[PDB]
Amino acid sequence: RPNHTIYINNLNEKIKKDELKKSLHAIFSRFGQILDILVSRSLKMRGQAFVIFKEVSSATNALRSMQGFPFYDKPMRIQYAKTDSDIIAK
RNA sequence: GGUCACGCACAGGGCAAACCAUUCGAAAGAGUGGGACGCAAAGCCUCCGGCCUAAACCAUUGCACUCCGGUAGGUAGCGGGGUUAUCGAUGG
Ligand SMILES: Nc1nc2c(ncn2[C@@H]2O[C@@H]3COP(=O)(O)O[C@H]4[C@@H](O)[C@H](n5cnc6c(=O)[nH]c(N)nc65)O[C@@H]4COP(=O)(O)O[C@H]3[C@H]2O)c(=O)[nH]1
Numbered sequence: 001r002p003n004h005t006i007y008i009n010n011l012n013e014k015i016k017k018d019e020l021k022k023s024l025h026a027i028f029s030r031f032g033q034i035l036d037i038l039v040s041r042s043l044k045m046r047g048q049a050f051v052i053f054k055e056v057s058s059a060t061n062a063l064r065s066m067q068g069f070p071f072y073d074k075p076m077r078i079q080y081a082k083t084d085s086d087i088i089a090k
Numbered sequence: 091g092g093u094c095a096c097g098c099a100c101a102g103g104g105c106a107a108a109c110c111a112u113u114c115g116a117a118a119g120a121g122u123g124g125g126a127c128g129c130a131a132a133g134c135c136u137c138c139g140g141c142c143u144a145a146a147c148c149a150u151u152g153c154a155c156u157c158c159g160g161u162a163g164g165u166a167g168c169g170g171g172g173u174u175a176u177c178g179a180u181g182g
């Protein structure tokens with residue numbers, strides 16, 4: 001069930017999108033070349049983030065290394081992406 | 091002459107985008123002064139659609155790459171609608 005993208009939920013929702021990406025990017029750049037980080041704060045898509053990696057191995061690396069990680073007072077709930085991104089599926 | 095539409099003007103004007111200064115605001119943004127991009131209602135009003143904001147409240151653990159909660163505020167120079175008003179092409 002591995003994927004280029006990893007799905008994080010259970011995040012402090014009152015963190016601004018602009019800032020939020022960077023906070024993850026600094027934490028997650030260390031595993032591979034991140035193509036893009038998708039973050040929204042709409043009713044459905046808040047408190048959660050998608051991180052797209054260059055390598056699938058790098059997404060696996062990030063997943064098994066930081067599960068439950070205390071991030072903004074909250075544990076990081078990471079799981080694989082069920083479906084790839086529109087930028088990958090091509 | 092009203093009145094209701096119309097804008098090809100005349101004459102008298104009026105308002106003031108951006109930007110800057112300053113104040114308020116969490117922000118969008120607004121106030122004031124300077125400034126003029128434009129505007130025949132660019133006068134005034136959030137009732138209706140859009141767009142902008144997200145500090146606090148309230149709900150949501152939620153799988154996206156169209157965008158989307160209530161709540162609240164903003165935009166009348168985003169339309170729509172409302173309401174008042176000016177000049178008057180041998181004007182219609
Ligand atoms: N008195 C009067 N005259 C009218 C009216 N409608 C049309 N006109 C005449 O027609 C010209 C052009 O009007 P416009 O195409 O709406 O274009 C206008 C308009 O967009 C703008 N403007 C001037 N005054 C006002 C105003 O009080 N309100 C608004 N919204 N726009 C204005 O400047 C442009 C040129 O205006 P002008 O040099 O005065 O020249 C005007 C004026 O001579 C009206 O309701 N009243």
Ligand SMILES: [Mg+2]
Nearest residue numbers: 100101102103
């Ligand atoms: Mg004139």
Ligand SMILES: [Mg+2]
Nearest residue numbers: 136138139140
């Ligand atoms: Mg509205």
